[PDB]
Amino acid sequence: GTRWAVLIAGSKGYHNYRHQADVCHMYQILRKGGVKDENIIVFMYDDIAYNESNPFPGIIINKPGGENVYKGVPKDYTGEDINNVNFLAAILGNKSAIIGGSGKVLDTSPNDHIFIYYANHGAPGKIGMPSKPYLYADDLVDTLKQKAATGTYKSMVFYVEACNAGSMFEGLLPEGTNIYAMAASNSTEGSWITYCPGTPDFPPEFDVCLGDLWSITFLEDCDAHNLRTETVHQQFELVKKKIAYASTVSQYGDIPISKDSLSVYMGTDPANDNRTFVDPLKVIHQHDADLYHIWCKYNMAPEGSSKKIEAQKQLLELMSHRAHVDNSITLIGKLLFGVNKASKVLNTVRPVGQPLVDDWQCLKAMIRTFETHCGSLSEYGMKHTLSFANMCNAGIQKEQLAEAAAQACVTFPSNPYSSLAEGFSA
Amino acid sequence: IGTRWAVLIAGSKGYHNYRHQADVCHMYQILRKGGVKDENIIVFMYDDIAYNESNPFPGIIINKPGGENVYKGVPKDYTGEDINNVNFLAAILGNKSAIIGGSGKVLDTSPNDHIFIYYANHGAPGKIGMPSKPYLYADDLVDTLKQKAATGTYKSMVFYVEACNAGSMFEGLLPEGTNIYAMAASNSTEGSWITYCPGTPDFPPEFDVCLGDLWSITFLEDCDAHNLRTETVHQQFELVKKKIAYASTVSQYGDIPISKDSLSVYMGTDPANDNRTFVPLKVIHQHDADLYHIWCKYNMAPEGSSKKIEAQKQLLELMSHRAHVDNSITLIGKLLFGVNKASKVLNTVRPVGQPLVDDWQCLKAMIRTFETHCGSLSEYGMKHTLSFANMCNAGIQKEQLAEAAAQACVTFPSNPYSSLAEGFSA
Numbered sequence: 001g002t003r004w005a006v007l008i009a010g011s012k013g014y015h016n017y018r019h020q021a022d023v024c025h026m027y028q029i030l031r032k033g034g035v036k037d038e039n040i041i042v043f044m045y046d047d048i049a050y051n052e053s054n055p056f057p058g059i060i061i062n063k064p065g066g067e068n069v070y071k072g073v074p075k076d077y078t079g080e081d082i083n084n085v086n087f088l089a090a091i092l093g094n095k096s097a098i099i100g101g102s103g104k105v106l107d108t109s110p111n112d113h114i115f116i117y118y119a120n121h122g123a124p125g126k127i128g129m130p131s132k133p134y135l136y137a138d139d140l141v142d143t144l145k146q147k148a149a150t151g152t153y154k155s156m157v158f159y160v161e162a163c164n165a166g167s168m169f170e171g172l173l174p175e176g177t178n179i180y181a182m183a184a185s186n187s188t189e190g191s192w193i194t195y196c197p198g199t200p201d202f203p204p205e206f207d208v209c210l211g212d213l214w215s216i217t218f219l220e221d222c223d224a225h226n227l228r229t230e231t232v233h234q235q236f237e238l239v240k241k242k243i244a245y246a247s248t249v250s251q252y253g254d255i256p257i258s259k260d261s262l263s264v265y266m267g268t269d270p271a272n273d274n275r276t277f278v279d280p281l282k283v284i285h286q287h288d289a290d291l292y293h294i295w296c297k298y299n300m301a302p303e304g305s306s307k308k309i310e311a312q313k314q315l316l317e318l319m320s321h322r323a324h325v326d327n328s329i330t331l332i333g334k335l336l337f338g339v340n341k342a343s344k345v346l347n348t349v350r351p352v353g354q355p356l357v358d359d360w361q362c363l364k365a366m367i368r369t370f371e372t373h374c375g376s377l378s379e380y381g382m383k384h385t386l387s388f389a390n391m392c393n394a395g396i397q398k399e400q401l402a403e404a405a406a407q408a409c410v411t412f413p414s415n416p417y418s419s420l421a422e423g424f425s426a
Numbered sequence: 427i428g429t430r431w432a433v434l435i436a437g438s439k440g441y442h443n444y445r446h447q448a449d450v451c452h453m454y455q456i457l458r459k460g461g462v463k464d465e466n467i468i469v470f471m472y473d474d475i476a477y478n479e480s481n482p483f484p485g486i487i488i489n490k491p492g493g494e495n496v497y498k499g500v501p502k503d504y505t506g507e508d509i510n511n512v513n514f515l516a517a518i519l520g521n522k523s524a525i526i527g528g529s530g531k532v533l534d535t536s537p538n539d540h541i542f543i544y545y546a547n548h549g550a551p552g553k554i555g556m557p558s559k560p561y562l563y564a565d566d567l568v569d570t571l572k573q574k575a576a577t578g579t580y581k582s583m584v585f586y587v588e589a590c591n592a593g594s595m596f597e598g599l600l601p602e603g604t605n606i607y608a609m610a611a612s613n614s615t616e617g618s619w620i621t622y623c624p625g626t627p628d629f630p631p632e633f634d635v636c637l638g639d640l641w642s643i644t645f646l647e648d649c650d651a652h653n654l655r656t657e658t659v660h661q662q663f664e665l666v667k668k669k670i671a672y673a674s675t676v677s678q679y680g681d682i683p684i685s686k687d688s689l690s691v692y693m694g695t696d697p698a699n700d701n702r703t704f705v706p707l708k709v710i711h712q713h714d715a716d717l718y719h720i721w722c723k724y725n726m727a728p729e730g731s732s733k734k735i736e737a738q739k740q741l742l743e744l745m746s747h748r749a750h751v752d753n754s755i756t757l758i759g760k761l762l763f764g765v766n767k768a769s770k771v772l773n774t775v776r777p778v779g780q781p782l783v784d785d786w787q788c789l790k791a792m793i794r795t796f797e798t799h800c801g802s803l804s805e806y807g808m809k810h811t812l813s814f815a816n817m818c819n820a821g822i823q824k825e826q827l828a829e830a831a832a833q834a835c836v837t838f839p840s841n842p843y844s845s846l847a848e849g850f851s852a
C-alpha cells in the first residue's frame with residue numbers, strides 16, 4: 001500500500017505559533033521517512049513565518065535550538081480554506097466538495113495506511129478551526145465511521161493535541177473501524193504548553209511558546225530512533241510516563257492496531273538506522289497561553305512606549321471577557337438550577353466510556369443561544385461546553401437557556417472578544 | 427555582497443494554463459539549486475494544476491516531457507484569489523501592511539541586494555494577466571517600478587516577462603537610470619509561442635495541454651545547462667533571441683548595461699554544473715492555446731461519449747465569442763472612422779520607443795464601456811487593447827464608444843465567455 005497523512009493546525013494568530021510549528025515538525029518526520037508529498041495533506045493558516053512579530057522571517061522552530069521546520073512544507077489549505085467542509089471532504093477523499101486550496105484529498109485504497117495529526121485548541125467534544133464554526137466530536141466521528149464503512153484503508157492512526165482531546169472519541173469511536181486514536185489529554189483534562197519565554201535556554205526575541213508538551217515529546221521521539229524498532233504502543237507508554245506530571249495520555253478505538261511499528265505510518269529516517277529503540281519541563285496551561293503571550297508582550301515592551309500601553313489595554317480586554325463569560329455562566333446556572341445546586345450540576349463529569357452529551361444538536365443550539373445574548377465565547381469560553389453538555393443531559397432546552405441568558409446579559413458586550421463578526425462557535 | 431531576491435508569478439489560472447505554473451515552478455528549481463534562499467523568493471501561483479482532476483500525475487508538474495517534477499518544494503506565498511494587483515505590487519514595493527491574504531512575504535530589500543522578477547502568462551498590448559480580474563496594465567506596473575527605483579533600496583534588478591506583446595509593458599514607459607533591465611518573450615506587436623504540445627515528438631499521450639512556453643523553455647533549460655558565473659544576461663539575451671528567431675523577437679528594455687552581469691548575480695549557480703562553462707520545436711500561438719486544448723480534449727475523447735459532446739459544445743462557444751468580439755470591434759471602428767478608413771486607424775502600432783497610449787485612464791475606461799455593452803473580452807478579446815489605444819490617441823471619448831457599442835450590440839451576449847461575473851478586465 002501507500003502511506004497517507006493529514007496534518008492540521010486548527011488555530012490562527014501569531015500567539016498560536018506552536019500549533020503550526022508542531023504540524024511543520026510532523027511533516028519533516030514524514031518527509032525524512034519517505035512519505036510522499038502527494039500523500040500528505042497539510043492544513044496550516046500560514047500567518048507565522050512572515051508575521052510582523054516573527055523575529056526570524058521564513059523560519060519556524062519547534063524547539064529552542066531546533067531546525068527550521070517551515071522549509072519545504074507543502075501548504076494545501078491556508079487562510080480561511082481551513083474549515084470543516086474542506087477538512088472532512090479531504091478525509092473522505094471527496095475532491096468535488098473542496099472549495100479553495102490545492103484540491104489534495106485522501107484518495108486511498110484498502111491496503112493504504114493513514115496517519116492523521118491534529119494540533120490546537122480543544123474543549124469538551126470540540127476541536128478548533130481557524131475559521132468558525134468549530135469541529136464537534138459528533139461530526140468528526142461520523143466522518144470517520146463513513147470512511148470506515150467504505151473500506152478504503154488497512155488501518156488508521158489519529159494523534160490529537162488539544163484540551164480534553166479524549167472527549168473527541170470517548171463513547172463515540174466504535175470498534176472494528178480500524179482506527180486507533182491517541183490523545184494529549186483525557187476527556188476532563190486540559191493540555192500543556194512547553195518551550196516558553198524566559199525559562200530554558202530560550203531566544204529572548206520570542207514572546208511566544210514554541211511547542212505543545214505532548215507534541216514535543218512524541219515528535220522528538222520520532223526523530224530519535226529507527227521507527228521500524230518502535231511500535232505505536234511503545235510510544236503510547238513512553239510519552240504517557242514522560243507527560244504523567246501534566247496530563248494523562250489516552251487511547252481510543254482499535255487498540256490492537258498500536259502493535260504496528262511507527263514506520264508503518266511514518267516510515268523511518270535512514271540517518272537513524274543504527275538508533276534502535278530501547279524500551280520535567282517548565283510548562284504552562286493551553287487555556288492561559290493568550291494571557292501569557294500578552295503578559296510577555298507587555299513585560300518586553302519599554303516603559304511609556306506605545307507597544308506597552310497597547311499590551312496593557314489588550315490584557316484588560318482579555319480579563320474582562322474571561323470575567324464576563326464566567327459570571328454569565330455562573331448566573332445562568334443559578335437561574336437554571338438554584339444558587340447551591342448550580343456548581344454540582346454544571347461541573348458533573350461523565351464516567352469512562354460515556355460520551356460528553358447524548359444530544360449533540362442540543363449542545364450546538366446551547367452554544368449558539370448563549371452567544372446571541374451573551375456574545376462570543378472566544379478561545380477561553382469554549383471550556384463551557386462542559387456546562388452546556390450538563391444542561392442538555394439535565395433536560396434543559398435552548399428556550400430555557402435563552403430566557404436565563406437574556407436575564408444574565410441585559411446588554412450585549414462591547415468587548416472585542418465578544419464579537420460575533422467571525423460567526424458563532426457552533 | 428547583498429542578498430539575492432526573486433519574485434515568481436504565474437498570472438493565469440485553469441488546467442489549460444498548466445504551462446505558466448510549470449514555467450514558474452522550473453524557475454524556482456534554478457534559484458533553489460543556485461543557493462537563493464526561500465525567505466527571499468516570493469512565489470505567486472494559483473495552485474489548481476498539481477491536484478487537478480484532469481492531471482494524470484497528482485502532485486507532479488513537468489515543464490518538459492522527460493523533465494523533473496518542478497512542483498516539489500515550491501513555497502507558495504500567494505495562491506488562489508490572493509494573486510491580484512494589490513498583493514503583487516505591494517510585494518514588489520516591500521509593503522507588508524498592504525498585503526491581504528497569503529504568507530505576507532514581501533521584497534524587504536537593502537541597497538546591495540539583487541532582484542530577479544519572472545512573470546509567465548497571458549499578455550496583450552500594455553496588459554499582463556492576473557488570475558483574478560482586473561488585469562495588470564503597463565502604467566500601474568511601470569509606476570510601481572519607478573516608485574521602487576526612486577524610493578526603494580537595491581543594487582540591480584532583472585525582469586523576465588513571458589506574455590503576448592511583452593515589450594509593450596516597458597516600451598515608452600520604463601525610464602533609464604532605474605537599474606532595471608527587462609527581457610521580453612516578444613516585442614510590443616507580436617504574440618508569444620507555446621511548445622511541448624500534444625501530438626508532435628514522443629509526447630506523453632495522457633496530457634491534452636502544452637507543458638511550456640517557447641521563450642521560457644529556452645531560457646530555463648539554458649540556466650540548467652551551464653555554470654551561471656560564465657554566462658552573462660547579455661549572452662543569454664543573444665542566445666535565446668537566435669534560437670526563438672523563427673517564432674518571436676526577444677526584446678530588451680531599461681538599463682541595458684545591467685545585462686553585462688553574469689546570471690549568477692541574480693540566480694546563483696548549481697555546483698553540479700561548475701565544469702559546464704558557457705560557450706526548430708513544434709510550436710503553437712499563445713492566443714490559440716484555448717482552441718488547441720479543447721481540440722485535444724475533443725479528439726482524445728471516445729466517439730459518442732459525454733466528454734466529446736461537452737468538448738464540441740465548448741469549441742463552438744469559444745469560436746462564437748471570438749467572432750462576436752471581432753465583429754463588434756470591426757462595426758464600432760466603422761461607426762467611428764468610416765467603412766474603409768477604420769481598419770488602418772485601429773490596427774496602427776507604435777514606432778520604437780513610443781508607449782501604447784498617452785492617456786491610460788482613457789484606455790481603461792474604453793475597455794470597461796465596451797464590456798458593459800458587448801460583454802467580457804475574455805483572454806481572446808484582450809488583443810483589442812490596441813484598438814482602444816488607437817481610439818484614445820485619435821481623440822475618441824468613452825461616450826462616443828458607448829453610443830457605437832450600443833449600436834454594435836443591441837443585445838448583451840448569452841455566451842459564457844462574455845460573462846462579467848468575475849468583473850471587468852480594467
Ligand SMILES: *[C@@H]1O[C@H](CO)[C@@H](O[C@@H]2O[C@H](CO)[C@@H](O[C@@H]3O[C@@H](C)[C@@H](O)[C@@H](O)[C@@H]3O)[C@H](O)[C@H]2NC(C)=O)[C@H](O)[C@H]1NC(C)=O
Pocket residue numbers: 012013014015046047048050051052053528529530
Ligand atoms: C500576524 O499575526 C497577527 C495575529 O495576531 C495577524 O493579525 C490579524 O490580522 C487580521 C487581518 O489582517 C485582522 O482581522 C480583521 O480583518 C478585517 C477584515 C477587519 O475586520 C479588521 O478589523 C481586521 O484587520 C485581525 O484583527 C488581526 N489580529 C490581531 C490579534 O491583531 C496578522 O494578519 C498575521 N499575519 C501576517 C501575514 O503577518
Ligand SMILES: *[C@@H]1O[C@H](CO)[C@@H](O[C@@H]2O[C@H](CO)[C@@H](O[C@@H]3O[C@@H](C)[C@@H](O)[C@@H](O)[C@@H]3O)[C@H](O)[C@H]2NC(C)=O)[C@H](O)[C@H]1NC(C)=O
Pocket residue numbers: 613614615616675775776777778
Ligand atoms: C516586432 O516583431 C515583428 C515580428 O512579428 C516585426 O515585424 C516584421 O518586421 C520585419 C522588418 O523588420 C518584416 O520583414 C520584411 O518581410 C518582407 C515584407 C520582406 O520585404 C523582407 O525583406 C522584410 O525584412 C516582417 O515581415 C515583419 N513581420 C510581421 C509579421 O509584421 C516588427 O518589425 C517588430 N515591431 C516593432 C514595432 O518593433
Ligand SMILES: *[C@@H]1O[C@H](CO)[C@@H](O[C@@H]2O[C@H](CO)[C@@H](O)[C@H](O)[C@H]2NC(C)=O)[C@H](O)[C@H]1NC(C)=O
Pocket residue numbers: 101102103104440441442473474475477478479480
Ligand atoms: C481544475 O482545473 C479547472 C479549470 O480547468 C477548475 O475548474 C473551474 O473551477 C472554478 C471553481 O471551482 C469554476 O468557477 C469553473 O467553472 C471551473 N472551470 C472549468 C472549465 O471547469 C478546477 O477548480 C480545478 N480543480 C482544482 C482541484 O483546483
Ligand SMILES: *[C@@H]1O[C@H](CO)[C@@H](O)[C@H](O)[C@H]1NC(C)=O
Pocket residue numbers: 186187188189247248349350351352
Ligand atoms: C482524567 O485524568 C485526571 C487526572 O488529571 C483524573 O482526575 C480523572 O479521573 C480522569 N478522567 C476520566 C474521565 O477518565
